[PDB]
């Protein structure tokens, strides 16, 4: 009769064979956050801020960059590929003249 204990669950998915994985690693970890103090938790929940329009509004592949210039000047800028749509972090569109 033998027993073993994995002290912490800090490692995430490992695709190495099971005979080679370290004790912490596991096969699947979805929607989880492996903190050091409490080993595994559920990810913090998404909180809805705003809806930014239809699916194609931002385009199939936008390049989105965050302009963190100041505490009050945090803005997101998306490049639709057809134009620029800038969003305040509260979700409010900021007009971009061209």
């Amino acid at each position: 009769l033998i027993s073993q204990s994995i002290k912490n669950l800090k490692g995430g998915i490992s695709q190495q064979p099971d005979i080679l994985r370290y004790p912490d690693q596991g096969s699947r970890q979805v929607n989880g956050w492996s903190s050091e103090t409490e080993g595994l938790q559920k990810r913090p929940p998404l909180v809805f801020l705003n809806t930014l329009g239809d699916n194609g509004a931002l385009g199939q592949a936008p390049y989105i960059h965050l302009i963190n210039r100041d505490e009050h000047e945090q803005y997101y800028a998306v490049f639709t590929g057809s134009g620029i749509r800038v969003f305040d972090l509260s979700g409010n569109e900021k007009q971009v003249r061209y």
């Binding site: 009769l1 033998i2 027993s3 970890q29 080993g39 909180v47 930014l52 699916n55 965050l66």
Partner: protein
Amino acid sequence: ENVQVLACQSISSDMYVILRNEFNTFLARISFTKNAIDLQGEPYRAFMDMKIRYTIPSGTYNDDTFTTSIHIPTIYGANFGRGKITVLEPDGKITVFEQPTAGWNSDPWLRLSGNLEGRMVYIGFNINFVYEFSKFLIKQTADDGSTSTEDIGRLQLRRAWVNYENSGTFDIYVENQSSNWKYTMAGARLGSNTLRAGRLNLGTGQYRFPVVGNAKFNTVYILSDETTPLNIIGCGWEGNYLRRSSGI
């Protein structure tokens, strides 16, 4: 299921995510705050995706069917393709609506049971947590850090334990080749100063559950879709080990 994720970028300890649906795109926020209630007045942090706090509009309740019904597009501004939506009242009451088969875009309405017209309901989809465990082999560290596992013997496993702290509603499924058993840790133990009628059931402890069989063929996964939190500190196992060929 269908959420195409545009580029999130963390600002401080808060991550701002942009998603597609594909009906309407949104900006959402993830913040790793240990002890906060993400929305105002919410009974406990509810780990539900897309949390919104909606004060119900007056026109919704109908006396004849005795239901109060809220349109999903009105609540979020967008129709959603799939998922289970939990509506949490200010009190602990939770009503979970599974997706209409067509989607939540065919029929949007969430038909809450009572007459709620001035209540504030925190509505959101459910996050699904899945953590499979690596197979429970005997892993012995070498003099060096690398760990080697003894696969040269039969380890028949008899029990296993998950040590948790302040967590709830988790289900641990042990599946042998043909068995599929599920064991649920549901909260504080009866009689604890923690289990109370109106408070969240969050408990600390070790849940020992039986995993029986050859280690090589047994799989354990922990799955939780509930609104409550989860913590897993450590995991043990015991079991008979008998390698006939005394190695090395």
